[PDB]
Amino acid sequence: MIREERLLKVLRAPHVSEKASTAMEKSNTIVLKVAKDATKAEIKAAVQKLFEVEVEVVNTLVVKGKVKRHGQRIGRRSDWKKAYVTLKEGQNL
């Protein structure tokens, strides 16, 4: 059993794009920004408890930060984790 504060901290934000909206419509899959250390099980439990839905599978990937330039210096955005969490076609989050 994963404790309460872990579940409250793993989920960070929902992803928004054409691919995200298409996933939601076609395959009932919401796309999330999750904690860099969050595992598939923690993500699944957190979606089951904070959003009050049912999950059958979660797919994760790590996005690499882009190298950018501001005023001639060099900078790199942080890496972050993206989750494709599917629902079992009966919740409509």
Q: Which residues bind RNA (CB under 7 A)?
A: 15-20, 23, 27, 29, 31, 39-41, 57, 59-64, 66-69, 79, 81-82, 84, 86
Closest CB 88 distance from RNA, rounded Å? 11
Strands 80-87 and 55-63: antiparallel
Closest CB 68 distance from RNA, rounded Å? 6
User: Closest CB to RNA among 49 and 64?
Assistant: 64
User: Closest CB to RNA among 19 and 50?
Assistant: 19
Burial per residue of 20-59, b for 16 or more beta-carbon CB atoms within 10 angstroms, e otherwise: beebeeeebbbbbbbbeebeeebbbbbbbeebebebeebe
